């Protein structure tokens, strides 16, 4: 990483449901909105493609179909971008995306597709209110741009930023409530409205990163 334009693509959160046991003792499954996370680790750019439940209208085996819908939407994004902004490599977080992406990207011979064993839980973002409410309340498909590194690259490298983000996402995934306490070291810690993450000093980030790492180790 950190050279070629690289995207991580996470399809985990595209097909989401709620399950409820009825008074009659049966389980009802109802789709709720999801999202594709498409992430550039060098710049911090996130394309968030909100997946409105209208897309499942008619359809069956929505779990499997979701992988194809993901590939469709990645291809669509690519075709909306100038060639200079298109990725050279796409790294899928889940191996089931490999074949749907290969087929949807046949017109893009420059683009290398591969899998990964990296733990990159974008699902944790569903716990960050900014994302979670936006996804919950959407009434139609849309794509929203974010910068997941806030102002960090002013003073740290992309490598350091990436590592910090992963620690944050993994910690949220393993223990949301404890990770949120670690990320709020003082009563006066705040997050700027256009930021994702808190405004912390260098010293405060050092402590945060060690505590996050420890939380992930404790699992
Ligand atoms: Cl770097
Ligand atoms: Co279509
Ligand atoms: Co800023």
XYZ file of N, CA and C and ligand atoms in Angstrom:
660
model
N 0.841 -1.239 0.000
C 0.000 0.000 0.000
C 0.862 1.269 0.000
N 0.215 2.392 -0.320
C 0.679 3.782 -0.128
C 1.448 4.452 -1.282
N 1.692 3.667 -2.353
C 2.367 4.113 -3.607
C 1.597 5.162 -4.389
N 0.132 3.573 -6.734
C -1.104 3.041 -7.314
C -2.342 3.357 -6.474
N -3.475 3.685 -7.094
C -4.778 3.890 -6.364
C -5.295 2.546 -5.980
N -5.523 2.361 -4.682
C -6.031 1.110 -4.129
C -7.331 1.383 -3.403
N -8.329 0.542 -3.659
C -9.566 0.514 -2.874
C -9.756 -0.786 -2.132
N -10.117 -0.697 -0.866
C -10.701 -1.787 -0.137
C -12.211 -1.718 -0.358
N -12.838 -2.864 -0.631
C -14.275 -2.939 -0.764
C -14.829 -3.903 0.256
N -15.781 -3.433 1.061
C -16.404 -4.294 2.096
C -17.869 -4.356 1.774
N -18.314 -5.582 1.493
C -19.732 -5.878 1.222
C -20.533 -6.435 2.397
N -19.906 -6.539 3.565
C -20.538 -7.197 4.719
C -21.934 -6.658 5.027
N -22.041 -5.337 4.944
C -23.181 -4.577 5.442
C -24.213 -4.193 4.373
N -24.147 -4.849 3.209
C -25.051 -4.511 2.105
C -26.455 -5.077 2.343
N -26.522 -6.362 2.704
C -27.797 -7.035 2.990
C -27.895 -7.194 4.489
N -28.816 -6.429 5.078
C -29.009 -6.364 6.510
C -30.498 -6.655 6.774
N -30.750 -7.342 7.873
C -32.138 -7.662 8.236
C -32.397 -7.472 9.721
N -33.679 -7.330 10.045
C -34.065 -7.536 11.419
C -34.896 -8.800 11.493
N -34.681 -9.508 12.579
C -35.422 -10.753 12.818
C -36.188 -10.576 14.112
N -37.432 -10.980 14.065
C -38.334 -10.890 15.192
C -39.160 -12.154 15.313
N -39.304 -12.597 16.546
C -40.209 -13.698 16.862
C -41.593 -13.151 17.109
N -42.575 -13.633 16.342
C -43.949 -13.162 16.419
C -44.674 -13.801 17.616
N -45.854 -13.275 17.952
C -46.685 -13.917 18.989
C -47.085 -15.365 18.696
N -47.143 -15.677 17.411
C -47.444 -16.962 16.923
C -46.193 -17.912 16.954
N -44.999 -17.361 17.275
C -43.800 -18.165 17.466
C -42.990 -18.458 16.237
N -43.240 -17.702 15.208
C -42.431 -17.783 13.956
C -41.488 -16.573 13.830
N -40.470 -16.705 12.991
C -39.476 -15.644 12.815
C -39.809 -14.888 11.528
N -39.927 -13.578 11.644
C -40.060 -12.712 10.487
C -38.723 -12.054 10.227
N -38.306 -12.048 8.975
C -37.049 -11.427 8.610
C -37.446 -10.268 7.688
N -36.976 -9.072 8.020
C -37.292 -7.899 7.198
C -35.961 -7.165 6.853
N -35.695 -6.992 5.553
C -34.510 -6.170 5.209
C -34.583 -4.764 5.732
N -33.388 -4.263 6.110
C -33.228 -2.848 6.445
C -32.106 -2.268 5.567
N -32.010 -0.922 5.482
C -30.971 -0.368 4.575
C -29.568 -0.847 4.991
N -28.709 -1.007 3.996
C -27.313 -1.294 4.204
C -26.434 -0.329 3.459
N -25.178 -0.720 3.336
C -24.174 0.119 2.691
C -22.969 -0.665 2.242
N -22.381 -0.202 1.137
C -21.083 -0.662 0.685
C -20.063 0.372 1.135
N -18.928 -0.096 1.669
C -17.828 0.801 2.025
C -16.704 0.573 1.024
N -16.298 1.638 0.360
C -15.251 1.612 -0.648
C -14.201 2.609 -0.147
N -12.981 2.163 0.163
C -12.076 2.947 0.989
C -10.642 3.027 0.394
N -10.127 4.268 0.264
C -8.764 4.486 -0.219
C -7.854 4.686 0.974
N -6.975 3.719 1.270
C -6.168 3.801 2.501
C -5.080 4.886 2.477
N -4.713 5.343 1.312
C -3.700 6.373 1.231
C -4.280 7.725 1.576
N -5.450 8.058 1.037
C -5.993 9.379 1.209
C -7.047 9.467 2.315
N -7.647 8.324 2.701
C -8.685 8.284 3.676
C -10.067 8.428 3.084
N -10.137 8.571 1.774
C -11.450 8.718 1.125
C -12.312 7.487 1.259
N -13.539 7.721 1.696
C -14.550 6.683 1.750
C -15.687 7.067 0.824
N -16.063 6.166 -0.099
C -17.325 6.288 -0.830
C -18.283 5.325 -0.097
N -19.347 5.880 0.427
C -20.365 5.143 1.110
C -21.551 5.058 0.204
N -21.830 3.874 -0.332
C -23.018 3.694 -1.195
C -24.118 3.045 -0.378
N -25.135 3.840 -0.066
C -26.283 3.397 0.742
C -27.157 2.583 -0.142
N -27.494 1.415 0.414
C -28.283 0.386 -0.227
C -29.699 0.422 0.397
N -30.620 1.021 -0.353
C -32.022 1.127 0.083
C -32.743 -0.159 -0.138
N -33.605 -0.521 0.820
C -34.319 -1.804 0.722
C -35.138 -1.998 -0.537
N -35.485 -0.910 -1.243
C -36.194 -0.985 -2.545
C -35.452 -1.841 -3.532
N -34.135 -1.910 -3.420
C -33.392 -2.727 -4.379
C -33.663 -4.223 -4.336
N -34.184 -4.702 -3.210
C -34.436 -6.132 -3.033
C -35.821 -6.456 -3.562
N -36.529 -5.454 -4.094
C -37.965 -5.640 -4.494
C -38.104 -6.721 -5.560
N -38.963 -7.716 -5.234
C -39.175 -8.944 -6.002
C -38.339 -10.098 -5.463
N -37.027 -9.814 -5.421
C -35.897 -10.779 -5.438
C -35.879 -11.833 -4.321
N -35.175 -12.947 -4.559
C -34.903 -13.986 -3.540
C -33.386 -14.164 -3.345
N -33.020 -14.985 -2.345
C -31.654 -15.323 -1.938
C -30.845 -14.054 -1.869
N -31.318 -13.127 -1.002
C -30.835 -11.755 -1.099
C -29.407 -11.744 -0.633
N -29.022 -12.585 0.305
C -27.605 -12.715 0.687
C -26.616 -12.965 -0.429
N -26.970 -13.850 -1.347
C -26.109 -14.123 -2.439
C -26.162 -13.020 -3.508
N -27.372 -12.588 -3.783
C -27.599 -11.512 -4.727
C -26.844 -10.258 -4.276
N -26.740 -10.024 -2.955
C -26.072 -8.822 -2.415
C -24.646 -8.690 -2.927
N -23.955 -9.797 -3.132
C -22.560 -9.778 -3.633
C -22.538 -9.240 -5.091
N -23.494 -9.650 -5.889
C -23.616 -9.163 -7.244
C -24.037 -7.694 -7.276
N -24.952 -7.304 -6.406
C -25.365 -5.875 -6.338
C -24.151 -5.030 -5.972
N -23.339 -5.525 -5.049
C -22.125 -4.822 -4.667
C -21.222 -4.613 -5.873
N -20.999 -5.695 -6.625
C -20.120 -5.597 -7.790
C -20.675 -4.608 -8.807
N -21.976 -4.663 -9.037
C -22.638 -3.718 -9.917
C -22.360 -2.266 -9.495
N -22.465 -2.013 -8.215
C -22.342 -0.638 -7.745
C -20.869 -0.196 -7.778
N -19.936 -1.108 -7.531
C -18.507 -0.746 -7.665
C -18.235 -0.365 -9.109
N -18.687 -1.215 -10.053
C -18.471 -0.950 -11.466
C -19.081 0.383 -11.874
N -20.281 0.640 -11.384
C -20.959 1.901 -11.653
C -20.147 3.114 -11.163
N -19.570 2.991 -9.987
C -18.764 4.064 -9.476
C -17.550 4.274 -10.362
N -16.877 3.164 -10.680
C -15.733 3.267 -11.530
C -16.019 3.973 -12.840
N -17.129 3.598 -13.460
C -17.466 4.197 -14.746
C -17.849 5.715 -14.616
N -18.252 6.145 -13.438
C -18.549 7.563 -13.179
C -17.345 8.395 -12.969
N -16.193 7.768 -12.748
C -14.918 8.491 -12.444
C -14.072 8.626 -13.711
N -13.350 9.748 -13.860
C -12.311 9.819 -14.905
C -11.311 8.680 -14.701
N -10.660 8.262 -15.784
C -9.696 7.184 -15.745
C -8.585 7.428 -14.731
N -8.136 8.681 -14.628
C -7.109 9.041 -13.660
C -7.495 8.785 -12.203
N -8.792 8.745 -11.914
C -9.259 8.536 -10.535
C -9.663 7.061 -10.239
N -9.628 6.214 -11.284
C -10.038 4.809 -11.157
C -8.960 4.028 -10.393
N -9.360 3.015 -9.612
C -8.389 2.240 -8.842
C -7.572 1.348 -9.799
N -6.320 1.118 -9.412
C -5.495 0.078 -10.011
C -5.658 -1.298 -9.392
N -5.989 -1.339 -8.096
C -6.207 -2.567 -7.345
C -7.440 -2.406 -6.513
N -8.251 -3.460 -6.458
C -9.388 -3.548 -5.552
C -9.115 -4.765 -4.694
N -9.181 -4.538 -3.404
C -8.980 -5.532 -2.372
C -10.296 -5.746 -1.665
N -10.852 -6.928 -1.831
C -12.145 -7.241 -1.296
C -11.914 -7.828 0.077
N -12.728 -7.402 1.034
C -12.575 -7.954 2.387
C -13.137 -9.400 2.549
N -14.020 -9.828 1.616
C -14.663 -11.137 1.685
C -14.512 -11.825 0.340
N -14.122 -13.104 0.379
C -13.747 -13.833 -0.816
C -14.948 -14.034 -1.795
N -16.166 -13.986 -1.271
C -17.334 -14.134 -2.136
C -17.529 -13.026 -3.163
N -16.840 -11.889 -2.965
C -16.893 -10.787 -3.915
C -15.994 -10.993 -5.134
N -15.086 -11.992 -5.109
C -14.059 -12.106 -6.177
C -14.682 -12.372 -7.558
N -15.584 -13.348 -7.628
C -16.146 -13.711 -8.915
C -17.123 -12.675 -9.437
N -18.031 -12.173 -8.566
C -18.948 -11.112 -9.064
C -18.175 -9.895 -9.570
N -17.126 -9.497 -8.850
C -16.322 -8.371 -9.313
C -15.592 -8.661 -10.610
N -15.027 -9.859 -10.741
C -14.317 -10.230 -11.988
C -15.269 -10.037 -13.191
N -16.468 -10.567 -13.063
C -17.441 -10.497 -14.160
C -17.920 -9.070 -14.427
N -18.180 -8.300 -13.376
C -18.592 -6.915 -13.595
C -17.509 -5.973 -14.092
N -16.268 -6.355 -13.922
C -15.135 -5.506 -14.334
C -14.349 -5.968 -15.557
N -15.026 -6.733 -16.395
C -14.374 -7.210 -17.619
C -13.923 -6.123 -18.563
N -14.587 -4.965 -18.505
C -14.153 -3.839 -19.368
C -13.025 -3.022 -18.759
N -12.487 -3.470 -17.614
C -11.421 -2.756 -16.940
C -10.221 -3.623 -16.722
N -9.516 -3.916 -17.834
C -8.417 -4.832 -17.723
C -7.278 -4.275 -16.873
N -7.224 -2.967 -16.619
C -6.123 -2.469 -15.826
C -6.329 -2.876 -14.357
N -7.541 -3.257 -13.961
C -7.808 -3.329 -12.522
C -7.592 -4.729 -11.988
N -6.668 -4.862 -11.049
C -6.356 -6.095 -10.365
C -7.276 -6.304 -9.145
N -7.901 -7.456 -9.024
C -8.821 -7.779 -7.960
C -8.174 -8.869 -7.103
N -8.156 -8.666 -5.796
C -7.647 -9.697 -4.906
C -8.379 -9.675 -3.596
N -8.270 -10.771 -2.885
C -8.802 -10.948 -1.573
C -7.773 -10.585 -0.524
N -8.174 -10.703 0.726
C -7.370 -10.296 1.855
C -7.730 -11.081 3.099
N -6.761 -11.297 3.967
C -7.117 -11.781 5.328
C -7.101 -10.709 6.394
N -6.977 -9.461 5.964
C -6.975 -8.369 6.919
C -8.301 -8.182 7.592
N -8.239 -7.815 8.873
C -9.418 -7.516 9.675
C -9.689 -6.038 9.608
N -10.661 -5.692 8.763
C -11.090 -4.338 8.474
C -12.584 -4.202 8.645
N -13.062 -4.176 9.888
C -14.502 -4.225 10.120
C -15.223 -2.905 9.966
N -15.478 -2.541 8.734
C -16.354 -1.371 8.473
C -17.747 -1.433 9.084
N -18.224 -2.633 9.390
C -19.461 -2.820 10.141
C -19.461 -1.988 11.421
N -18.278 -1.752 12.008
C -18.223 -0.958 13.232
C -18.740 0.466 12.979
N -18.610 0.933 11.748
C -19.125 2.247 11.399
C -20.593 2.400 11.573
N -21.348 1.294 11.523
C -22.786 1.347 11.742
C -23.122 1.861 13.190
N -22.151 1.759 14.095
C -22.182 2.215 15.488
C -21.773 3.657 15.692
N -21.220 4.254 14.672
C -20.839 5.622 14.727
C -22.080 6.391 14.243
N -22.689 7.234 15.089
C -24.027 7.820 14.753
C -24.162 8.443 13.391
N -23.159 9.247 13.021
C -23.072 9.842 11.717
C -23.390 8.853 10.610
N -22.695 7.735 10.553
C -23.054 6.738 9.541
C -24.367 5.977 9.779
N -24.527 5.520 11.001
C -25.650 4.669 11.343
C -26.987 5.333 11.093
N -27.156 6.592 11.532
C -28.414 7.282 11.247
C -28.624 7.605 9.770
N -27.539 7.973 9.083
C -27.645 8.240 7.677
C -28.150 6.997 6.925
N -27.574 5.833 7.225
C -28.000 4.579 6.594
C -29.436 4.240 6.999
N -29.739 4.362 8.306
C -31.069 3.985 8.839
C -32.155 4.750 8.139
N -31.968 6.066 8.057
C -33.038 6.968 7.623
C -33.157 7.189 6.111
N -32.213 6.668 5.324
C -32.299 6.856 3.913
C -33.574 6.321 3.312
N -34.133 7.092 2.391
C -35.348 6.689 1.636
C -35.145 6.266 0.195
N -33.890 6.301 -0.244
C -33.545 5.966 -1.591
C -32.027 5.701 -1.667
N -31.552 5.062 -2.721
C -30.102 4.893 -2.946
C -29.405 6.238 -3.048
N -28.204 6.297 -2.506
C -27.335 7.480 -2.712
C -25.916 7.140 -2.331
N -25.005 7.946 -2.806
C -23.614 7.782 -2.437
C -23.149 9.050 -1.747
N -22.406 8.869 -0.652
C -21.936 9.939 0.216
C -20.415 9.794 0.375
N -19.693 10.894 0.234
C -18.250 10.904 0.394
C -17.893 11.332 1.812
N -16.869 10.667 2.326
C -16.261 10.983 3.615
C -14.751 10.941 3.524
N -14.139 11.571 4.507
C -12.694 11.522 4.757
C -12.452 10.872 6.150
N -12.127 9.568 6.179
C -12.077 8.874 7.443
C -10.856 9.234 8.287
N -9.959 10.053 7.757
C -8.759 10.466 8.494
C -8.860 11.882 9.087
N -10.003 12.524 8.927
C -10.169 13.880 9.480
C -8.973 14.735 9.081
N -8.343 15.427 10.038
C -7.194 16.258 9.713
C -5.865 15.561 10.011
N -5.914 14.259 10.200
C -4.706 13.550 10.657
C -3.480 13.680 9.735
N -3.717 13.666 8.439
C -2.580 13.660 7.463
C -1.817 14.984 7.452
N -2.354 16.014 8.104
C -1.548 17.221 8.315
C -0.226 16.897 9.051
N -0.311 15.956 10.002
C 0.790 15.664 10.890
C 1.284 14.239 10.987
N 0.572 13.291 10.403
C 1.051 11.925 10.329
C 0.976 11.370 8.888
N 1.699 10.283 8.669
C 1.662 9.620 7.385
C 0.392 8.853 7.138
N 0.218 8.499 5.884
C -0.899 7.593 5.559
C -0.815 6.236 6.243
N 0.405 5.699 6.348
C 0.618 4.447 7.037
C 0.132 4.560 8.503
N 0.538 5.632 9.183
C 0.141 5.820 10.590
C -1.388 6.012 10.683
N -1.950 6.835 9.776
C -3.395 7.060 9.775
C -4.137 5.741 9.578
N -3.751 4.964 8.567
C -4.409 3.679 8.315
C -4.405 2.822 9.562
N -3.241 2.728 10.170
C -3.104 1.869 11.361
C -4.045 2.351 12.472
N -4.087 3.674 12.680
C -4.977 4.259 13.705
C -6.438 3.934 13.403
N -6.823 4.088 12.139
C -8.234 3.803 11.777
C -8.561 2.337 12.027
N -7.683 1.437 11.612
C -7.985 0.030 11.800
C -8.162 -0.299 13.305
N -7.251 0.215 14.111
C -7.348 0.002 15.564
C -8.726 0.496 16.085
N -9.133 1.659 15.613
C -10.430 2.245 16.025
C -11.560 1.308 15.599
N -11.580 0.889 14.332
C -12.687 0.065 13.847
C -12.704 -1.303 14.555
N -11.537 -1.934 14.680
C -11.487 -3.239 15.351
C -11.931 -3.122 16.802
N -11.533 -2.044 17.476
C -11.891 -1.870 18.912
C -13.382 -1.680 19.030
N -13.952 -0.811 18.192
C -15.420 -0.680 18.166
C -16.116 -1.986 17.914
N -15.574 -2.770 16.999
C -16.210 -4.041 16.692
C -16.180 -4.975 17.927
N -15.027 -5.052 18.607
C -14.836 -6.018 19.716
C -15.566 -5.569 20.970
N -15.621 -4.267 21.251
C -16.312 -3.779 22.443
C -16.639 -2.284 22.255
N -17.765 -2.022 21.605
C -18.205 -0.664 21.238
C -18.178 0.276 22.447
N -18.805 -0.150 23.546
C -18.968 0.802 24.656
C -17.612 1.140 25.283
N -16.712 0.176 25.396
C -15.400 0.456 25.962
C -14.530 1.294 24.981
N -14.645 1.026 23.694
C -13.869 1.762 22.711
C -14.278 3.231 22.713
N -15.569 3.495 22.875
C -16.060 4.850 22.916
C -15.580 5.604 24.164
N -15.410 4.892 25.284
C -14.829 5.522 26.469
C -13.348 5.846 26.255
N -12.597 4.902 25.690
C -11.213 5.148 25.360
C -11.048 6.372 24.439
N -11.943 6.512 23.494
C -11.931 7.646 22.558
C -12.440 8.948 23.107
N -12.859 8.966 24.349
C -13.275 10.199 25.017
C -12.491 10.329 26.327
N -11.215 10.663 26.243
C -10.411 10.702 27.443
C -10.753 11.797 28.450
N -11.464 12.827 28.023
C -11.852 13.886 28.979
C -13.283 14.324 28.754
N -13.886 14.893 29.811
C -15.233 15.378 29.692
C -15.383 16.382 28.522
N -14.310 17.095 28.193
C -14.326 18.152 27.175
C -13.842 17.685 25.799
N -13.535 16.387 25.650
C -13.188 15.878 24.330
C -14.354 16.044 23.396
N -14.130 16.585 22.190
C -15.209 16.688 21.239
C -14.778 16.242 19.847
N -15.782 16.006 19.044
C -15.602 15.701 17.614
C -16.174 16.876 16.826
N -15.379 17.432 15.928
C -15.920 18.516 15.047
C -17.075 17.993 14.206
N -18.079 18.837 13.921
C -19.189 18.384 13.063
C -18.813 17.730 11.715
N -17.780 18.214 11.047
C -17.395 17.589 9.789
C -16.404 16.450 9.941
N -15.989 16.189 11.164
C -15.107 15.027 11.459
C -15.876 13.779 11.877
N -15.213 12.639 11.732
C -15.685 11.351 12.197
C -15.238 11.062 13.652
N -13.994 11.374 13.931
C -13.286 10.982 15.118
C -12.973 12.207 16.011
N -12.690 11.971 17.304
C -12.450 13.127 18.191
C -11.204 13.947 17.841
N -11.196 15.200 18.297
C -10.028 16.020 18.286
C -9.195 15.720 19.549
N -8.077 15.055 19.323
C -7.162 14.634 20.403
C -5.760 15.139 20.136
N -4.998 15.395 21.211
C -3.585 15.761 21.086
C -2.746 14.533 20.705
N -1.489 14.801 20.357
C -0.577 13.733 19.964
C -0.403 12.775 21.106
N -0.198 13.298 22.303
C -0.033 12.477 23.475
C -1.303 11.653 23.734
N -2.479 12.261 23.572
C -3.724 11.586 23.808
C -3.872 10.439 22.771
N -3.507 10.675 21.508
C -3.576 9.571 20.525
C -2.661 8.412 20.841
N -1.482 8.686 21.375
C -0.560 7.608 21.761
C -1.197 6.674 22.786
N -1.802 7.250 23.787
C -2.489 6.497 24.844
C -3.698 5.785 24.277
N -4.483 6.454 23.464
C -5.624 5.830 22.847
C -5.231 4.621 22.044
N -4.169 4.739 21.278
C -3.827 3.639 20.357
C -3.390 2.404 21.148
N -2.638 2.578 22.221
C -2.240 1.463 23.074
C -3.468 0.825 23.765
N -4.391 1.633 24.252
C -5.617 1.108 24.874
C -6.512 0.365 23.893
N -6.582 0.880 22.672
C -7.354 0.180 21.649
C -6.759 -1.182 21.327
N -5.467 -1.202 21.120
C -4.731 -2.430 20.879
C -4.921 -3.417 21.980
N -4.888 -2.935 23.225
C -5.075 -3.832 24.354
C -6.497 -4.412 24.373
N -7.466 -3.612 23.978
C -8.868 -4.051 23.972
C -9.039 -5.145 22.940
N -8.405 -4.979 21.781
C -8.501 -5.960 20.718
C -7.797 -7.238 21.111
N -6.663 -7.119 21.800
C -5.974 -8.324 22.314
C -6.787 -9.098 23.356
N -7.516 -8.374 24.188
C -8.328 -8.979 25.250
C -9.543 -9.699 24.639
N -9.985 -9.251 23.456
C -11.232 -9.678 22.773
C -12.326 -10.124 23.701
Cl 2.721 6.412 4.175
Co -29.033 -2.100 -11.962
Co -11.133 18.938 9.237
